[PDB]
Scaffold this active site. Structure first.
Site, PDB file in Angstrom:
ATOM      1  N   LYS A  41       0.817  -1.209   0.000  1.00  0.00           N
ATOM      2  CA  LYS A  41       0.000   0.000   0.000  1.00  0.00           C
ATOM      3  C   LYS A  41       0.848   1.256   0.000  1.00  0.00           C
ATOM      4  O   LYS A  41       0.390   2.309   0.420  1.00  0.00           O
ATOM      5  CB  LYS A  41      -0.917   0.033   1.221  1.00  0.00           C
ATOM      6  CG  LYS A  41      -1.974  -1.055   1.267  1.00  0.00           C
ATOM      7  CD  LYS A  41      -3.081  -0.843   0.263  1.00  0.00           C
ATOM      8  CE  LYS A  41      -4.035  -2.018   0.302  1.00  0.00           C
ATOM      9  NZ  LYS A  41      -4.524  -2.289   1.682  1.00  0.00           N
ATOM     10  N   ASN A  42       2.083   1.152  -0.475  1.00  0.00           N
ATOM     11  CA  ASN A  42       2.969   2.305  -0.507  1.00  0.00           C
ATOM     12  C   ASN A  42       3.076   2.964  -1.878  1.00  0.00           C
ATOM     13  O   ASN A  42       2.799   2.340  -2.906  1.00  0.00           O
ATOM     14  CB  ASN A  42       4.361   1.906  -0.052  1.00  0.00           C
ATOM     15  CG  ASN A  42       5.318   3.062  -0.087  1.00  0.00           C
ATOM     16  OD1 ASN A  42       5.110   4.077   0.580  1.00  0.00           O
ATOM     17  ND2 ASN A  42       6.369   2.930  -0.874  1.00  0.00           N
TER      18      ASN A  42
END
Ligand SMILES: CCCCN(CCC1CCCCC1)Cc1ccc(C(=O)N[C@@H](CCSC)C(=O)O)c(-c2ccccc2C)c1
Ligand SMILES: CC(C)CCCC(C)CCCC(C)C[C@@H](O)P(=O)(O)O
Ligand SMILES: [Zn+2]
Lengths: 397, 315
Positions: free
Chosen positions: B110-111
């Site tokens: 989720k970066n």
């Protein structure tokens, strides 16, 4: 009683068509815990906790604003946001910000500001439009001859021009990425510090449009799924750029509206995805814009009382499912509170409580009369007044 | 050579290879705000990072130093910046790098910076061979990671890799027909390859869409896609669509339908049709069920489709 509670409201539950796919299951589990919350009134229900922890979120915000545990080590490089959420959140709740921190805040942000325009995650980090937004959008809440001066409007402009790309969209940071998120920051900033040349966003409106996909909503970058956060970015940027109409407003409205949960009451950032507080602003933030859009365009039908979404069922969720006993607000029941949500989860309440399309006004304050927050500007998410002030300042230059 | 998690890990001040340099305490000013009480290990690393960064030291040791500054906060774009640099100068092996980033991304999907950092590498090597498979594995942990899909759209455009994607879309479709992301993927692989103008193509899709509609009547994706690929040309352009949708009222009703119709009747009221008075109510009627019955939460909205349609269709 409260809509969310009503008996026949349990008709808006999930019908999975006797079929099952992860999406179904997840939506299923949420509907459970969400129900349990509503039903949780069978024994006592005189003066429901339909209260808004004014003082309780305050400690969380007042304190977190001066120091944060090693847990916040992940926000190490986005410190100006950690300022912005808090300063805002307070204003919403309505706690005067001590004129002594006022400096420190400013004195801080002045330390992130790169000698080459924009601000950084923290002292000594490369400039990046997110914090830079946060920082500026923050300094403006303070609105003092002190804050306004922090910003080096000259350099800010140069920085912007650097991230500037050919097709129109800007990079996020030097050598960084590109998505609506970018444009919104540029716009949001430049407009406030009134630093827009007739050749800055040349094409940008055009690009933000290539973002609106087949779903009527907007996505990160062309071809990407519709998403509420980016959508807000895209639209808002265009409300600044004065290009709203450049999109298919009708294909857009249709979508946003479908983003609200026919059960819970809040929004889902994307079709077939769990509900989530922060989007209470990201999504429902859209209608107060779409309103200015249509009305401007010259549309009758538009109501004169509410926004085009169930304002009650939203507050009825933010209140019964997003507040923390300890304090601060959150995603969905049973989820580590954080200053982000604590911010946008409230901004999403102000939206749902207030209406101001035209000289006329009409609020809808669910819960106790002590739950009315201060207004929030639809495009900047900051004091609808701190906004007018901010601009009515830099303009004299 | 170590790691940040190995027990034998030592701070940097307590190190030899790092004694010929002085740390740079982060100055948060006399009266700090939103300050973090960085753990000893964390605060230490960066005090050292700065010192490097500040000395633009393109050393082999700074490099390793980054990996750690990244573990402590792989969200720190600055550290990522100074890394690509070291890669440039020290002229590091990029596959040796790819392997490292596949890891990280696998770890924190989720970066943002970790992905964009994979794109950079890739466009550098000009080789996307690994991609389609990687992304796929990520998508097999989260069949909806935005980044994952986005990274994928790019990797597919930049390298004209369509050929076997429509199959992929169909695959995950079985897995979870409700996956709105996948549906968006389809309309990516088509609008960019064959388009929908093709009589056979638009035919093929609509048919199938309807299939998924009958199989799962409340799949709000199948419906948004049906209305999605037929909305440009207008609906009044496909008459039959109004009848078939009528053979679903029974064991297939869904507010997702109630609306499509209304939508249809809308486009109809925009194209001089016969019974420019029979529909105008046949629909204003259907707006009731919505706002008061089947889709009440969206009452406010419907109570506008109603007004709008009247406001421009009378006398
Ligand atoms: C299931 C996936 C959830 C994604 N979600 C992040 C949740 C965060 C909220 C804050 C506490 C830690 C967990 C939302 C989100 C999406 C994009 C960004 C986003 O804009 N992305 C950048 C933010 C850079 S700030 C320098 C990134 O590097 O990841 C951000 C955001 C916003 C402000 C500050 C920090 C962050 C993470 C949050
Ligand atoms: C920075 C903004 C003004 C708005 C950001 C709005 C967002 C909440 C963005 C959501 C990012 C996306 C696509 C989701 C990712 O967390 P993932 O790919 O892990 O699902
Ligand atoms: Zn959220």
């Amino acid at each position: 009683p409260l809509y969310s509670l009503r008996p026949e409201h349990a008709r808006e539950r999930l019908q999975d068509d006797s079929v099952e796919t992860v999406t179904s299951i997840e939506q299923a589990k949420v509907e459970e815990k969400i129900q349990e919350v509503f039903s949780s009134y069978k024994f006592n229900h005189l003066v429901p906790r339909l209260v808004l922890q004014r003082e309780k979120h305050f400690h969380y915000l007042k304190r977190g604003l001066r120091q944060l545990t090693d847990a916040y080590e992940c926000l190490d490089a986005s410190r100006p946001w950690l300022c912005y959420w808090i300063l805002h959140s307070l204003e919403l709740l309505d706690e005067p910000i001590p004129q002594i921190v006022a400096t420190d805040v400013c004195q801080f942000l002045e330390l992130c500001q790169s000698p080459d325009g924009g601000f950084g995650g923290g002292p000594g980090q490369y400039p990046h439009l997110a914090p830079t937004y946060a920082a500026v959008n923050a300094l403006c809440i303070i609105g003092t001859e002190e804050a306004y001066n922090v910003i080096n409007r000259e350099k800010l402009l140069q920085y912007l021009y650097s991230l500037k790309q050919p097709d129109g969209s800007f990079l996020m940071h030097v050598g960084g990425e590109v998505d609506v998120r970018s444009a919104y920051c540029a716009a949001s900033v430049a407009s406030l510090t009134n630093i827009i040349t007739p050749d800055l966003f040349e094409g940008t409106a055009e690009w933000i449009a290539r973002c609106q996909n087949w779903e009527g909503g907007i996505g990160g970058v062309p071809g990407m799924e519709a998403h509420g956060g980016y959508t807000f970015c895209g639209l808002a940027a265009l409300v600044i750029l004065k290009k709203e109409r450049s999109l298919n407003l009708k294909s857009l409205l249709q979508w946003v509206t479908s983003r609200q949960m026919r059960f819970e009451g809040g929004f889902q950032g994307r079709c077939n995805k769990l509900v989530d507080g922060c989007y209470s602003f990201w999504q429902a933030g859209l209608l107060p814009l779409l309103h200015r859009a249509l009305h401007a365009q010259g549309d009758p039908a538009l109501s004169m009382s509410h926004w085009m979404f169930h304002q009650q069922a939203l507050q009825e969720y933010i209140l019964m499912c997003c507040q923390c006993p300890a304090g601060g607000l959150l995603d969905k029941p049973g989820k580590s509170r954080d200053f982000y949500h604590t911010c946008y989860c409230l901004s999403g309440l102000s939206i749902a409580q207030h209406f101001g399309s035209g000289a006329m006004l009409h609020d809808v304050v669910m819960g106790v009369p002590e739950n009315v927050l201060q207004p929030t500007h639809p495009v900047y998410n900051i004091g609808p007044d701190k906004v007018i002030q901010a601009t009515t300042h830099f303009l004299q230059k | 050579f170590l790691s940040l998690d190995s027990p034998t890990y030592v701070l940097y001040r307590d190190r030899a290879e790092w004694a010929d340099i002085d740390p740079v305490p982060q100055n948060d000013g006399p009266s700090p705000v939103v300050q973090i009480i960085y753990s000893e290990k964390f605060r230490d690393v960066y005090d050292y990072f700065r010192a490097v960064l500040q000395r633009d030291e393109r050393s082999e040791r700074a490099f390793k130093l980054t990996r750690d500054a990244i573990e402590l906060n792989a969200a720190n774009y600055t550290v990522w910046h100074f890394r690509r640099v070291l890669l440039r100068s020290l002229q590091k092996d990029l596959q040796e790098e790819m392997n490292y980033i596949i890891a990280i991304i696998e770890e924190q999907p989720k970066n943002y910076q970790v992905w964009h950092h994979r794109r950079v590498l890739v466009e550098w090597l000009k080789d996307p061979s690994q991609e389609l498979e990687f992304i796929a594995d990520i998508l097999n942990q989260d069949a909806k990671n935005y980044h994952a899909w986005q990274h994928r759209q790019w990797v597919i455009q930049e390298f004209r890799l369509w050929d076997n994607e429509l199959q992929y879309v169909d695959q995950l479709l079985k897995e979870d027909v409700r996956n709105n992301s996948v549906w968006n993927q389809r309309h990516f692989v088509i609008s960019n390859t064959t388009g929908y103008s093709d009589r056979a193509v638009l035919e093929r899709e609509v048919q199938y869409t309807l299939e998924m509609i009958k199989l799962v009547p409340h799949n709000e994706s199948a419906w948004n896609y049906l209305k999605g690929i037929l909305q440009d040309r207008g609906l009044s352009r496909y008459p039959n669509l109004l009848n078939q949708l009528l053979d679903l009222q029974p064991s297939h009703s869904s507010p997702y339908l109630i609306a499509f119709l209304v939508d249809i009747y809308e486009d109809m009221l925009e194209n001089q049709c016969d019974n420019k008075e029979d529909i105008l109510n046949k629909a204003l009627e259907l707006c009731e069920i919505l706002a008061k019955e089947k889709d009440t939460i969206r009452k406010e909205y419907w109570r506008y489709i109603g007004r709008s349609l009247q406001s421009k269709h009378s006398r």
